[PDB]
Amino acid sequence: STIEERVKKIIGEQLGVKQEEVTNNASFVEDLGADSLDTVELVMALEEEFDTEIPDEEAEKITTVQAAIDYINGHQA
User: Fold this and answer.
1) Are 77 and 7 a contacting pair, CB within 8 Å?
2) Which of 16, 29, 70, 77 has the fewest CB atoms below 10 angstroms from its CB?
C-alpha cells in the first residue's frame, strides 16, 4: 500500500473522490446507497494497487475514501 500515488491520481478518475474535505464516513458520493460497481471495481483497483487484505479495525469501517485511505496510510509501503 504505497498509498498516495494510487490514492491519487485523485481517486484516479476522482471515482472514489473526497469532494467533501469531510471526514471518512462520507464516501465516493456513497453513504446513503451509492453506485455499487464504482466502489466494487475501485476497491478491486485499491486491493491490487495497495496489494493487501483488510481486517475491520484497520478498516475502521471503510466507506472506501478517507478510511481505506487512512488505513493505507497506517499500512504504508
Assistant:
1) no
2) 77
* Catalytic site positions: 35
Q: Alpha-carbon distance 8 to 67, whole Å?
A: 14
In the block, cell 491519487 appears at: 8
The arrangement of secondary structure in 1-77, i.e. its CATH architecture, is: Orthogonal Bundle (1.10)
Amino acid present at 18: K
Domains of the chain, by residue range, sit at 1-77
**Backbone torsion region of residue 76, taken as left when φ is above 0, otherwise alpha when ψ lies between -120 and 50, otherwise beta:** left
CA distances from 66 to 28, 32 (A): 10, 17
This structure was determined by NMR
